Write a protein that binds this DNA or RNA. Structure first.
Ligand SMILES: [Zn+2]
Ligand SMILES: [Zn+2]
Ligand SMILES: [Zn+2]
Ligand SMILES: [Zn+2]
Lengths: 72, 73
DNA sequence: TAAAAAGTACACGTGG
DNA sequence: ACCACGTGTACTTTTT
């Protein structure tokens, strides 16, 4: 089973979406915080296990488009 | 009129490893050349490297260091 | 007596 | 919670 945000090994159904632990914690942190992230490319970065660290802007966007939300 | 880092356009501090750079790019290059680091670009290998965004893509930042001529000797 | 460039070390923030 | 890791500033050493 695979995190729909980064393709790492999923941990569970977190905030609506099958995701890994790091993406779960990441999303909670992004929402619940003054987080003004800026993409260095084209707001279309690749989010896999390594690259996910590179662009929190695109990882968060992808969290959202995947449907994550703090309310179930 | 102040000196600009040829890698990231922050204010340079001096000529480091052959190239006019900021302190941050001086030590970033040294670390990249001496350590073995798996840098991948999440974009198209043309990410914007400025003071605000240089942390996002080490792979592109290192490539620009190289292209600019930085060398450890 | 000093500037430039190289080396070293501490604090910090994000991430897992 | 807690530690690893990348980063950037500031300091010291070496160089000229
Ligand atoms: Zn994930
Ligand atoms: Zn991006
Ligand atoms: Zn720079
Ligand atoms: Zn890049």
């Amino acid at each position: 089973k695979l995190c729909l945000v980064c393709s790492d090994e999923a941990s569970g159904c977190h905030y609506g979406v099958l995701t890994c632990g790091s993406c779960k914690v990441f999303f909670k942190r992004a929402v619940e915080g003054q987080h003004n992230y800026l993409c260095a490319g084209r707001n279309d970065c690749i989010i896999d296990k390594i690259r996910r660290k590179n662009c929190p802007a695109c990882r968060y966007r992808k969290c959202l488009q995947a449907g994550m939300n703090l309310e179930a």
